RNA sequence: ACAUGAGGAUCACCCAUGU
RNA sequence: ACAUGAGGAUCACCCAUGU
RNA sequence: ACAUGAGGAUCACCCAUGU
RNA sequence: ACAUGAGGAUCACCCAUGU
């Protein structure tokens, strides 16, 4: 068994779907990268650690690129015009049973579901109002 | 119009669903809290700001409580035995059109969808393997 | 294949069996824990390192908790009254054939077979005499 | 009781089984060895002592010879190329009843049971994957 | 995908082919070995990492045993007289698309193709003349 | 004989094949480059040195360019946008027979055969997983 | 860093010693 | 190194303060 | 000079370490 | 205050370093 597998980061139906695959697991940091030029690839990293006697802390990171071609002196290169950086840290007391962890996961999924306040503000370059 | 409304943080079908409602919007930080004792409530905060000339930064936070009764000297109080803290920061260059922001949102939803590596490791008190 | 699968650590004859599942492979240390709060889980860890130019050393560690519910600060938390620690290191020469290895495995199995000296002494809180 | 008796270490289903028999008790340290020279013998030693005020600790040591291409009764050097060493340290808190100790013995038998990850890795000259 | 599977390393046209199979993944470093003792095994290991900000680097290592006059399962010393070591470091600029990478793989297959200078020199215990 | 001949480094099936021809043997380093300006050529170098009293070490180096036309100082020059570098060192004991060597060659060929793990990971800008 | 310890642990940590 | 910060990044880096 | 490094490179060059 | 950190929290606080 492994959970260090490729998965769909961006679901665009079934065509235009962004798939991120395992690339490296050095020093406890799992990394996934989408295919083609590393310069225009999506990247996900995830590590977990005992942050204190009572807590374990997950550090999850995602990079969404703005794909573009850079032309400098007639030599063009595939680059990312720019990138968005999602950095998230989740702390969980060592007392959490498996049911507690699941509730935590639902809370995370709910916060981001379509229609809810946060994903709507972001999807529209807005804030709360 | 407003997006500062109540929403379902934890969907448990249609009964056992955790709903978080607007509570305060002081100094640009939107807060939502579930009902009943504030001591055992769920909390979501979200603020957005121009972090640099090119970027706007969202700071989203969620608190999932472990509901318990504390008894001290015969006087019981509704408390949270402990809490999980989700802290996330999302940076977006000011060049992102609305389509870019949407792609960013899908990437966030995809990372957490059921079955994918990250929500599975968390839901099971595990790491990547 | 992939030998990183789950298994029953304590076989209580199909009912009350303690099964341990894969949970982390960060740093080359394969970990397996049981479904519990991490404060009350059985943990099994395994790592192999080429300890010398001509040896390989496996380091296997097992933790068996005595579960309990403790009232700290007036609140109840799932905890482990105590833990028993098994620590084994096995050093095998690089010259050992697959069958040479199969012999080490049978030797460890026989050593702990019910009814033999060592497991009898242990289960009876006794020494060998 | 009297548990310091002869036992089958490597069970080959009757034909070519390896029986190890009492050979030394200097210092309360029970030793068992097979019918061979000591350079080519299967050896097992076991002792218990109270490690700390809260723990008792069993120290079990097993030596297994590299058998493929072995010359019985011969002088094989370096010793290190022809022998595998197993070292087990079992720590049991003074509170552990006999029943607690029996469960621990099961946890050890389960870890080494045929078909489980750990024994299958050792036997195949592998690690966890 | 899932490319960490068993493959034929030395193709002898069916009879006496050498198949190498997954044996370790500690640290994201995939390892494959043949069915032998580790002193006489065929071994392959591979890892990728981002070497500099502009490059990614694959490190592939192969170990091949001296087979002429070999005693299977035997202890053959010095180790250095009985083993050949191959070390490959492939540096690929982050701009390289998948198609660029395919061409590179061809450049490697061509270099080692039968009848070409490099493989013919190695195989004849020679240099270039 | 003379193994210092030309060969097709990138076989694009008879049309668009990159052949590399012998170009220098100064300093015991056999060099081969493709027909191009030296700024845009594929280069292959090979040297063998008796690295130890009992070893011989082959050092093979391959360079695959990403060709481009760059406008420097208002003028157009044939250039290489970037280069991918392969670096391999093979160490063989002086005790290796011609057939022992032929085995190392087949092992390197199998390693890179289309469809096997390593060349699949590389061509897909991926890691082994 | 190794190495060995019927050295310790709250257990992927600490000790002491021979290199 | 710990910890926190609606501190910053080019994103497993960097900055400030309370152990 | 060797030696080893899932050390780096602009790649027949540089690094660090055990001799 | 900016910035970063698989730095910490009791979580819009606190810590370190590069402006």
UniProtKB/Swiss-Prot annotation, chains A, B, C, D, E, F:
A Gene Ontology molecular function term of the record: RNA binding
Gene Ontology process terms (BP): negative regulation of viral translation; regulation of translation
One Gene Ontology CC term in the entry: T=3 icosahedral viral capsid
InterPro entries: Levivir_coat, Phage_RNA-type_capsid
UniProt keyword RNA-binding, yes or no: yes
SUPFAM superfamilies: RNA bacteriophage capsid protein
Protein localization: Virion
Keyword Cell wall biogenesis/degradation in record: no
Tree of life domain: Viruses
Pfam families, sorted: Levi_coat
Primary location recorded for the protein, binned into one broad class: virion
Region called Viral RNA-binding, residue ranges: 31-104
Keywords per UniProt: Capsid protein, RNA-binding, T=3 icosahedral capsid protein, Translation regulation, Virion
Record text on subunit structure and interactions: Homodimer. The capsid proteins form dimers that assemble by group of 5. Twelve such pentamers are linked together with free dimers. The homodimers binds to the viral RNA via an operator hairpin, but also to many other RNA sequences in the viral genome; this interaction probably shifts the virus from the replicative to the assembly phase and ensures specific encapsidation of the viral genome.
Family under the similarity heading: Belongs to the Leviviricetes capsid protein family.
Protein function: Capsid protein self-assembles to form an icosahedral capsid with a T=3 symmetry, about 26 nm in diameter, and consisting of 89 capsid proteins dimers (178 capsid proteins). Involved in viral genome encapsidation through the interaction between a capsid protein dimer and the multiple packaging signals present in the RNA genome. The capsid also contains 1 copy of the A2 maturation protein.
Name of the protein described by the UniProt record: Capsid protein
């Amino acid at each position: 068994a492994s959970n260090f597998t490729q998965f769909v980061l961006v679901d665009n139906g079934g065509t235009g779907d962004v798939t991120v695959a395992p690339s490296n697991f050095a020093n406890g940091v799992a990394e996934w990268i989408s295919s083609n030029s590393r310069s225009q690839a999506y990247k996900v990293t995830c590590s977990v650690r005992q942050s204190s006697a009572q807590n374990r802390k997950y550090t999850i990171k995602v990079e969404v690129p703005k794909v573009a071609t850079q032309t400098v002196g007639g030599v063009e290169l595939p680059v990312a015009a720019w990138r968005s950086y999602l950095n998230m840290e989740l702390t969980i007391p060592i007392f959490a049973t498996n049911s507690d962890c699941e509730l935590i996961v639902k809370a995370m999924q709910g916060l981001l579901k379509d229609g809810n306040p946060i994903p709507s503000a972001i999807a529209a370059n807005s804030g709360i109002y």
